[PDB]
Amino acid sequence: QSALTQPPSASGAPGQRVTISCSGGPSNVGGNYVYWYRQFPGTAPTLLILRDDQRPSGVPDRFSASKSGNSASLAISGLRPDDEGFYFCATYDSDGSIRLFGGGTALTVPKAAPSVTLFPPSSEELQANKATLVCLISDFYPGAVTVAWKADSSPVKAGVETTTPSKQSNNKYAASSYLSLTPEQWKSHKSYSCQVTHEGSTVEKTVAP
Amino acid sequence: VWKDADTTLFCASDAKAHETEVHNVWATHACVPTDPNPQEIHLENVTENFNMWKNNMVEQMQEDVISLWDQSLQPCVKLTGGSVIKQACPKISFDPIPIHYCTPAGYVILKCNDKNFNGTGPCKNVSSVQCTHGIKPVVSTQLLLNGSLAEEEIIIRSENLTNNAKTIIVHLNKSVEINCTRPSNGDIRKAYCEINGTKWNKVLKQVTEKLKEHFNNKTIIFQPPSGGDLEITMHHFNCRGEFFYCNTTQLFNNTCIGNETMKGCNGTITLPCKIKQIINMWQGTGQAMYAPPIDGKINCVSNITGILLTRDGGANNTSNETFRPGGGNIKDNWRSELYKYKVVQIE
Amino acid sequence: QLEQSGTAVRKPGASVTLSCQASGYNFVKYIIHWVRQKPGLGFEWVGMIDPYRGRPWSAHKFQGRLSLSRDTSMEILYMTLTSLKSDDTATYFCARAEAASDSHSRPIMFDHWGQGSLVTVSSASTKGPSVFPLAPSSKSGGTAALGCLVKDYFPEPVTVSWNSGALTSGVHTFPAVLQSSGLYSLSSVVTVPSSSLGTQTYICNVNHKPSNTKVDKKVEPKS
Ligand SMILES: *[C@@H]1O[C@H](CO)[C@@H](O)[C@H](O)[C@H]1NC(C)=O
Ligand SMILES: *[C@@H]1O[C@H](CO)[C@@H](O)[C@H](O)[C@H]1NC(C)=O
Ligand SMILES: *[C@@H]1O[C@H](CO)[C@@H](O)[C@H](O)[C@H]1NC(C)=O
Ligand SMILES: *[C@@H]1O[C@H](CO)[C@@H](O)[C@H](O)[C@H]1NC(C)=O
Ligand SMILES: *[C@@H]1O[C@H](CO)[C@@H](O)[C@H](O)[C@H]1NC(C)=O
Ligand SMILES: *[C@@H]1O[C@H](CO)[C@@H](O)[C@H](O)[C@H]1NC(C)=O
């Protein structure tokens, strides 16, 4: 039986103490215990807390677990940075049935800015009777922005798709914005804005022959 | 006085030395004659805790039969790990005899005599013994055969009721006959087993009625094995050295129960079975090929005394629990007999 | 000790085949729960595959659809699933447990996990590319950028290089957006100075597998 309910976690700071539960529809002793996990690229998602055992070989002490109620509490006194990753609860559900999992939480965590870049459709594409716009998104922090295309002085209401931020190498973020145009419309409407907002002090370079 | 302990037991038998039948010769050589007057004194108002799942006696029997099988039943061919095995593959004389397991000094065997004992936990009516009762090393899958019966109710035994991964052993209070035959003198490997449908569906009707009491009057469901090898998925067994794999699909006929005077579900049941010479040993030890069958009339008749079961996962159905035949393994065969016993060290 | 591995894309409606090779001992007494991942979220029990016997289990919810598989000897596994769907793009996993059934430790838990077995499920078939040359704004700011227009290709992924990979300054292999109809739009840029030009022109670099389509299309600012 049993369910689960988790808030995303957490826009923390590189050190402060945090305490996150893995609470199930069993709001009783359940989840009686849990495994919380690391979960990385090319890596095994790597478990943190065992029950019926401590931390295995090759594991350090700073992770303690304690509950009461359904009030579980995965606790960090000393936050760490490569906690800039994803963490999930694992269910016993009475050794079944059946075993559930948590909502996942990540902590990498009011001021701009990116270096913004905008560019117009290539001729060859217009030689292909098509046209492709690029409003790129780059060199900002955090990877949390609100994209806004506009008709220079008026709204834009379509032709557009927002990514999941797919960060740069520099741990400052990366993203790309693109607008849908008819070649007719590409050159029917004089100018197309692309205000990707990073902490609302949003500057843009636009394109208009 | 004592404390829970594990130690190595010995075996006893009335095995006959001239029989070449392997159990006779073996027990003739590996086990001893019986004690004609073994003593048992009951201790008044004493309660003791048990754990049927850890009695190395099991480990000893499994190990022993395995060692035997590994050294006695050379197939014409064995495929194992990185090696390849070839040979002549000869005929044998085969017929199990009862085996008793008995304890040495400084240890004793404790027995739960609680008629309704589940195999773990306290037993109010406990006795002590020097040697066990006679246990047939009945090798079977799905079903436990020719075992001891519960003296009162059919008993359900399991390591973790919540865990569908834990095998359920069903202890019968009534034996059920299965009659398997390759008739004298065309498929030379074709055989069949006849079973009485009525006895089975009746006891089983009773078991279901009983199961609901444990499953909140929830719907009780049987399902076919999800899949797998014939070796694990079928009732697999040996008669005079020849290997049977029998399909138990027909048995979980849900429609055949409700006391509804009905068709299909009736009469003497004749189930078709077939034989395979080549198998993967469940010991995980590889593959075996044995030589071909005898001329003539082939027959093995058995009493059914126990069952191994696997449960379907998938909670929140809230009305039903779903089950599929097949449970653990032969250790359960020895376990099904052992729920009331444990070895202790005398201190 | 534990390597999952699989290929990415096939069309929906069909069926599939999945591995996870591990250590023999881990195959001795540990069933392996297959679970799956979704874009950035927490796991799903699909079923269990025992190390022994091959007694299979997974939820009844595939009764007509399912089959489970393995290899005892070769220390290796297979899974197979029916009814693929265009929306079914994400990573799968395998996990063990001593299970109060291994050692005298007696714990049940997902000890080690899979590297992940990627998925990319598209009804669309392999696709010939739409490549285009991004006229950079030829143009204080004595330093500018150009890149390529990665359009209309299928399936994943795209390779990017510059000066045959020799170029990396401000070079950035930018994200793909597998856009609605199913065309990823991937990007890459590279930054250049006011001083290098007249000789210094620049290209984006790709090879599309199911078509063996090796593209290097010249990016120019317009006539
Ligand atoms: C079980 O209980 C009855 C009633 O007290 C007793 O006569 C019997 O001896 C007990 N069984 C054993 C094995 O002691
Ligand atoms: C066998 O066990 C069932 C389970 O309770 C019971 O209903 C039935 O009466 C038993 N058989 C006999 C002959 O008593
Ligand atoms: C078992 O089957 C044989 C024939 O295969 C038959 O002769 C015999 O009567 C059957 N068993 C019983 C108890 O009748
Ligand atoms: C289940 O029971 C019905 C009712 O007698 C019968 O017609 C049907 O064939 C049975 N299913 C089997 C034998 O698989
Ligand atoms: C099964 O056993 C019952 C028990 O009385 C009997 O009435 C019936 O005739 C038997 N059916 C067979 C042997 O097919
Ligand atoms: C059960 O006992 C009978 C009687 O000796 C025998 O013929 C049969 O082979 C035995 N089978 C099993 C599996 O115990």
Tab-separated table of C-alpha atoms in Angstrom, chain B residues 10-316:
chain	number	residue	atom	x	y	z
B	10	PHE	CA	24.021	-37.379	12.539
B	11	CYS	CA	21.496	-39.661	10.766
B	12	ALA	CA	19.890	-43.022	11.532
B	13	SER	CA	18.053	-45.651	9.467
B	14	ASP	CA	16.949	-49.261	8.909
B	15	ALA	CA	18.475	-49.020	5.431
B	16	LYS	CA	19.070	-52.404	3.777
B	17	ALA	CA	22.590	-53.174	2.549
B	18	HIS	CA	21.701	-55.607	-0.236
B	19	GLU	CA	19.359	-53.266	-1.879
B	20	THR	CA	21.339	-51.359	-4.495
B	21	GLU	CA	18.633	-48.787	-4.191
B	22	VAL	CA	20.745	-45.815	-3.290
B	23	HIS	CA	18.943	-44.706	-0.175
B	24	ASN	CA	19.145	-48.196	1.275
B	25	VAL	CA	22.867	-48.589	0.553
B	26	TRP	CA	23.645	-45.045	1.531
B	27	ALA	CA	21.705	-44.991	4.759
B	28	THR	CA	23.041	-48.507	5.267
B	29	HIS	CA	26.503	-46.917	5.173
B	30	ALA	CA	25.895	-43.304	6.389
B	31	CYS	CA	23.279	-43.789	9.061
B	32	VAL	CA	22.698	-45.987	12.046
B	33	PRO	CA	20.117	-48.382	13.556
B	34	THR	CA	17.336	-46.895	15.719
B	35	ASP	CA	17.051	-46.508	19.525
B	36	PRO	CA	14.218	-48.807	20.468
B	37	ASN	CA	13.149	-46.909	23.628
B	38	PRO	CA	13.791	-43.190	23.222
B	39	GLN	CA	12.734	-41.080	26.228
B	40	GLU	CA	10.611	-37.946	26.167
B	41	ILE	CA	9.593	-36.023	29.321
B	42	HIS	CA	7.283	-32.985	29.109
B	43	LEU	CA	8.175	-29.791	31.071
B	44	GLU	CA	5.132	-28.215	32.755
B	45	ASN	CA	3.892	-24.656	31.963
B	46	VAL	CA	7.046	-23.756	29.941
B	47	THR	CA	6.931	-21.576	26.807
B	48	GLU	CA	9.769	-21.523	24.264
B	49	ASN	CA	10.446	-19.527	21.065
B	50	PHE	CA	11.267	-21.085	17.706
B	51	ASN	CA	12.676	-20.178	14.309
B	52	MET	CA	11.998	-22.813	11.667
B	53	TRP	CA	14.048	-20.923	9.055
B	54	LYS	CA	17.418	-21.555	10.661
B	55	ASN	CA	18.168	-25.124	11.435
B	56	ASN	CA	21.418	-26.237	9.800
B	57	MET	CA	19.833	-29.701	9.779
B	58	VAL	CA	18.272	-28.337	6.658
B	59	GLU	CA	21.648	-27.221	5.466
B	60	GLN	CA	23.002	-30.629	6.330
B	61	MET	CA	20.352	-32.530	4.471
B	62	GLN	CA	20.444	-30.230	1.447
B	63	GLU	CA	24.231	-30.407	1.390
B	64	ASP	CA	24.147	-34.157	1.746
B	65	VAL	CA	21.592	-34.743	-0.986
B	66	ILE	CA	23.443	-32.267	-3.209
B	67	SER	CA	26.790	-33.936	-2.602
B	68	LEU	CA	25.096	-37.233	-3.407
B	69	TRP	CA	23.456	-35.938	-6.523
B	70	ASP	CA	26.715	-34.412	-7.607
B	71	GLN	CA	28.598	-37.756	-7.111
B	72	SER	CA	25.845	-40.310	-7.786
B	73	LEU	CA	23.902	-38.989	-10.654
B	74	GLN	CA	26.437	-38.448	-13.301
B	75	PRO	CA	24.394	-37.697	-16.444
B	76	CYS	CA	25.657	-38.860	-19.802
B	77	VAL	CA	26.420	-35.200	-20.187
B	78	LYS	CA	27.104	-32.174	-17.919
B	79	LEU	CA	27.497	-28.509	-18.985
B	80	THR	CA	28.897	-26.460	-16.123
B	81	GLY	CA	30.638	-23.141	-15.726
B	82	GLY	CA	33.534	-23.457	-18.147
B	83	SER	CA	33.620	-27.271	-18.383
B	84	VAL	CA	32.055	-29.867	-20.699
B	85	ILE	CA	31.160	-33.409	-19.474
B	86	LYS	CA	30.638	-36.774	-21.427
B	87	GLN	CA	29.746	-40.419	-20.277
B	88	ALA	CA	27.876	-43.811	-20.556
B	89	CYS	CA	24.791	-42.849	-18.403
B	90	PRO	CA	23.542	-46.251	-16.845
B	91	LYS	CA	20.164	-47.336	-15.231
B	92	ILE	CA	19.523	-47.435	-11.442
B	93	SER	CA	17.376	-49.003	-8.674
B	94	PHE	CA	15.606	-46.154	-6.867
B	95	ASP	CA	13.345	-45.950	-3.822
B	96	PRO	CA	13.636	-43.522	-0.861
B	97	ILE	CA	13.696	-44.782	2.713
B	98	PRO	CA	12.859	-42.707	5.868
B	99	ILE	CA	15.687	-40.779	7.495
B	100	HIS	CA	15.969	-39.832	11.136
B	101	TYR	CA	18.413	-37.120	12.273
B	102	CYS	CA	19.690	-37.467	15.855
B	103	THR	CA	21.649	-35.336	18.255
B	104	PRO	CA	24.970	-35.860	20.240
B	105	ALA	CA	26.043	-34.800	23.767
B	106	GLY	CA	25.957	-31.169	24.899
B	107	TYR	CA	23.106	-30.514	22.476
B	108	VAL	CA	19.473	-31.725	22.308
B	109	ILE	CA	16.557	-31.322	19.879
B	110	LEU	CA	13.652	-29.198	20.977
B	111	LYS	CA	10.243	-29.912	19.603
B	112	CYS	CA	7.124	-27.751	19.470
B	113	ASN	CA	4.142	-29.999	20.219
B	114	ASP	CA	1.640	-27.194	19.879
B	115	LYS	CA	-0.812	-28.717	17.511
B	116	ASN	CA	-1.448	-25.303	15.997
B	117	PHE	CA	2.215	-24.124	16.002
B	118	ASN	CA	3.202	-21.850	13.087
B	119	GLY	CA	6.951	-22.726	13.117
B	120	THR	CA	8.350	-19.591	14.764
B	121	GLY	CA	7.517	-18.103	18.111
B	122	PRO	CA	6.470	-19.580	21.396
B	123	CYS	CA	5.368	-23.157	21.789
B	124	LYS	CA	3.470	-23.892	24.974
B	125	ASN	CA	3.561	-27.637	24.600
B	126	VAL	CA	7.235	-28.425	24.044
B	127	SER	CA	9.121	-31.692	24.204
B	128	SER	CA	12.757	-32.707	23.908
B	129	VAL	CA	14.097	-35.525	21.794
B	130	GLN	CA	17.273	-37.426	20.999
B	131	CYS	CA	16.422	-38.140	17.357
B	132	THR	CA	13.952	-36.909	14.762
B	133	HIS	CA	10.983	-38.649	13.106
B	134	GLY	CA	11.630	-40.318	9.715
B	135	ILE	CA	11.811	-37.701	6.890
B	136	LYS	CA	11.685	-38.620	3.204
B	137	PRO	CA	14.091	-36.532	1.120
B	138	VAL	CA	11.210	-35.835	-1.141
B	139	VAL	CA	12.419	-33.726	-3.951
B	140	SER	CA	9.655	-31.738	-5.500
B	141	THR	CA	8.782	-28.322	-6.762
B	142	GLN	CA	5.523	-26.482	-6.289
B	143	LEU	CA	4.211	-29.340	-4.144
B	144	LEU	CA	5.563	-31.011	-1.009
B	145	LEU	CA	4.893	-34.755	-1.060
B	146	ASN	CA	4.698	-37.663	1.378
B	147	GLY	CA	5.421	-35.406	4.341
B	148	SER	CA	3.961	-35.208	7.842
B	149	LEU	CA	0.548	-33.744	8.404
B	150	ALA	CA	-0.645	-31.103	10.781
B	151	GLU	CA	-2.568	-32.975	13.494
B	152	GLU	CA	-5.395	-30.420	13.453
B	153	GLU	CA	-5.691	-27.563	10.924
B	154	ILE	CA	-3.928	-27.096	7.606
B	155	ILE	CA	-1.043	-24.811	8.542
B	156	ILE	CA	0.342	-21.818	6.608
B	157	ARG	CA	4.038	-21.019	7.127
B	158	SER	CA	6.125	-18.077	5.819
B	159	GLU	CA	9.269	-15.990	6.466
B	160	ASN	CA	7.507	-12.655	5.769
B	161	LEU	CA	3.810	-12.554	4.985
B	162	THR	CA	4.112	-9.016	3.642
B	163	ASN	CA	6.857	-9.972	1.267
B	164	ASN	CA	5.534	-11.623	-1.836
B	165	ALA	CA	9.136	-12.692	-2.481
B	166	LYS	CA	8.863	-14.994	0.527
B	167	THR	CA	7.690	-18.437	-0.218
B	168	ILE	CA	4.584	-19.711	1.481
B	169	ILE	CA	4.591	-23.309	2.679
B	170	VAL	CA	1.170	-24.939	2.930
B	171	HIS	CA	0.892	-27.787	5.496
B	172	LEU	CA	-1.972	-30.161	4.773
B	173	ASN	CA	-4.194	-31.849	7.360
B	174	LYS	CA	-5.277	-34.185	4.509
B	175	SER	CA	-3.085	-36.111	2.000
B	176	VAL	CA	-3.948	-35.912	-1.730
B	177	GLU	CA	-3.237	-38.742	-4.173
B	178	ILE	CA	-1.510	-38.154	-7.549
B	179	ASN	CA	-1.156	-41.238	-9.724
B	180	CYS	CA	1.517	-40.939	-12.530
B	181	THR	CA	1.932	-43.520	-15.330
B	182	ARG	CA	3.724	-44.423	-18.588
B	183	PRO	CA	1.565	-47.465	-19.576
B	184	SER	CA	3.203	-50.667	-20.888
B	185	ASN	CA	3.950	-50.569	-24.620
B	186	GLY	CA	4.119	-43.781	-30.285
B	187	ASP	CA	5.622	-41.277	-27.844
B	188	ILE	CA	7.932	-43.182	-25.545
B	189	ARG	CA	8.220	-40.206	-23.155
B	190	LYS	CA	4.505	-39.474	-22.884
B	191	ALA	CA	2.904	-40.142	-19.541
B	192	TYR	CA	0.110	-38.816	-17.422
B	193	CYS	CA	-0.986	-38.395	-13.841
B	194	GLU	CA	-4.513	-38.941	-12.519
B	195	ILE	CA	-5.840	-36.991	-9.539
B	196	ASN	CA	-9.157	-36.886	-7.682
B	197	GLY	CA	-10.553	-33.379	-8.431
B	198	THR	CA	-13.173	-33.479	-5.628
B	199	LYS	CA	-10.899	-34.133	-2.663
B	200	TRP	CA	-8.619	-31.399	-3.863
B	201	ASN	CA	-11.189	-28.731	-4.637
B	202	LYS	CA	-12.967	-29.510	-1.367
B	203	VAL	CA	-9.939	-29.112	0.872
B	204	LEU	CA	-8.916	-26.181	-1.252
B	205	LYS	CA	-12.383	-24.647	-0.967
B	206	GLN	CA	-11.805	-24.941	2.755
B	207	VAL	CA	-8.315	-23.395	2.447
B	208	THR	CA	-9.732	-20.386	0.547
B	209	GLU	CA	-12.500	-19.927	3.074
B	210	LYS	CA	-9.719	-20.012	5.593
B	211	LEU	CA	-7.440	-17.648	3.599
B	212	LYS	CA	-10.030	-14.938	3.534
B	213	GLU	CA	-10.043	-14.901	7.323
B	214	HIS	CA	-6.384	-13.892	6.950
B	215	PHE	CA	-7.008	-11.641	3.965
B	216	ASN	CA	-9.864	-9.521	5.362
B	217	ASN	CA	-12.438	-11.536	3.366
B	218	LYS	CA	-10.625	-10.058	0.368
B	219	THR	CA	-10.806	-11.743	-2.987
B	220	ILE	CA	-8.456	-14.710	-3.125
B	221	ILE	CA	-6.726	-15.102	-6.463
B	222	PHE	CA	-4.671	-17.749	-8.186
B	223	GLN	CA	-2.736	-16.827	-11.287
B	224	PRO	CA	-0.555	-18.865	-13.635
B	225	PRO	CA	3.240	-18.617	-13.202
B	226	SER	CA	4.235	-15.337	-14.847
B	227	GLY	CA	6.840	-17.305	-16.738
B	228	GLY	CA	10.153	-19.155	-16.445
B	229	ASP	CA	11.895	-22.494	-16.767
B	230	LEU	CA	10.081	-25.795	-16.664
B	231	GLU	CA	12.420	-26.717	-13.845
B	232	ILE	CA	11.074	-23.970	-11.632
B	233	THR	CA	7.640	-23.380	-13.217
B	234	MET	CA	6.444	-26.999	-13.090
B	235	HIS	CA	5.973	-29.651	-10.514
B	236	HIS	CA	9.213	-31.427	-11.379
B	237	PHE	CA	10.130	-34.830	-9.939
B	238	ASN	CA	11.810	-38.210	-10.366
B	239	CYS	CA	10.259	-41.659	-10.675
B	240	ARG	CA	12.696	-44.594	-10.863
B	241	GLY	CA	15.272	-42.223	-12.318
B	242	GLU	CA	12.954	-40.812	-15.021
B	243	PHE	CA	12.230	-37.076	-14.954
B	244	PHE	CA	8.708	-35.597	-14.832
B	245	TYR	CA	7.623	-32.041	-15.317
B	246	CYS	CA	3.910	-31.603	-14.773
B	247	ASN	CA	1.819	-28.575	-15.575
B	248	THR	CA	-0.442	-27.537	-12.688
B	249	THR	CA	-2.456	-24.976	-14.756
B	250	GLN	CA	-5.776	-26.950	-14.573
B	251	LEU	CA	-5.771	-26.900	-10.764
B	252	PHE	CA	-6.534	-23.211	-10.218
B	253	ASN	CA	-9.855	-23.326	-11.830
B	254	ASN	CA	-11.619	-20.512	-9.890
B	255	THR	CA	-14.941	-21.390	-11.488
B	256	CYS	CA	-14.646	-24.955	-10.160
B	257	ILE	CA	-15.160	-23.999	-6.517
B	258	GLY	CA	-18.339	-22.283	-5.343
B	259	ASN	CA	-20.313	-25.502	-4.571
B	260	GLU	CA	-22.084	-24.741	-7.835
B	261	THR	CA	-23.021	-28.126	-9.298
B	262	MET	CA	-20.971	-27.604	-12.452
B	263	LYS	CA	-19.273	-29.139	-15.520
B	264	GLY	CA	-15.637	-28.973	-16.828
B	265	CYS	CA	-14.419	-29.018	-13.243
B	266	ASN	CA	-15.460	-32.644	-12.855
B	267	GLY	CA	-14.664	-36.346	-12.612
B	268	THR	CA	-11.478	-38.316	-12.161
B	269	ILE	CA	-8.787	-36.023	-13.518
B	270	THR	CA	-6.214	-37.372	-15.895
B	271	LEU	CA	-3.439	-34.788	-16.359
B	272	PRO	CA	-0.972	-35.199	-19.236
B	273	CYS	CA	2.768	-35.049	-18.291
B	274	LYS	CA	6.071	-35.245	-20.134
B	275	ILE	CA	9.677	-36.234	-19.473
B	276	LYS	CA	12.939	-34.338	-20.192
B	277	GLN	CA	16.358	-36.001	-19.980
B	278	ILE	CA	18.167	-32.657	-20.082
B	279	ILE	CA	17.877	-30.057	-17.374
B	280	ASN	CA	19.638	-27.122	-15.783
B	281	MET	CA	20.444	-28.141	-12.243
B	282	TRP	CA	18.727	-25.742	-9.868
B	283	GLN	CA	21.940	-26.020	-7.885
B	284	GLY	CA	22.953	-23.498	-10.557
B	285	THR	CA	25.631	-26.044	-11.265
B	286	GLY	CA	24.965	-26.433	-14.987
B	287	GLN	CA	23.142	-28.721	-17.388
B	288	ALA	CA	22.668	-32.517	-17.284
B	289	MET	CA	21.746	-35.175	-19.966
B	290	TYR	CA	20.732	-38.679	-18.847
B	291	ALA	CA	20.306	-41.936	-20.875
B	292	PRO	CA	17.025	-43.079	-22.441
B	293	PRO	CA	14.030	-45.017	-20.837
B	294	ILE	CA	13.286	-48.669	-20.052
B	295	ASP	CA	10.987	-50.946	-22.024
B	296	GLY	CA	7.644	-51.737	-20.252
B	297	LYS	CA	5.101	-50.629	-17.583
B	298	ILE	CA	6.005	-47.360	-15.738
B	299	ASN	CA	4.212	-46.132	-12.578
B	300	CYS	CA	4.820	-43.775	-9.630
B	301	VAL	CA	2.019	-43.111	-7.153
B	302	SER	CA	2.343	-40.291	-4.587
B	303	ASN	CA	0.546	-38.744	-1.601
B	304	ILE	CA	0.495	-34.923	-1.553
B	305	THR	CA	1.310	-33.364	1.833
B	306	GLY	CA	2.550	-29.802	1.231
B	307	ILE	CA	2.761	-26.731	-1.055
B	308	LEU	CA	5.284	-24.034	-2.048
B	309	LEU	CA	3.693	-20.672	-3.115
B	310	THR	CA	4.650	-17.299	-4.705
B	311	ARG	CA	2.545	-14.098	-4.337
B	312	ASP	CA	1.801	-11.435	-6.976
B	313	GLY	CA	2.988	-7.966	-5.965
B	314	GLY	CA	0.800	-4.940	-6.577
B	315	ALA	CA	-0.803	-3.504	-3.452
B	316	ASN	CA	-3.710	-1.039	-3.407
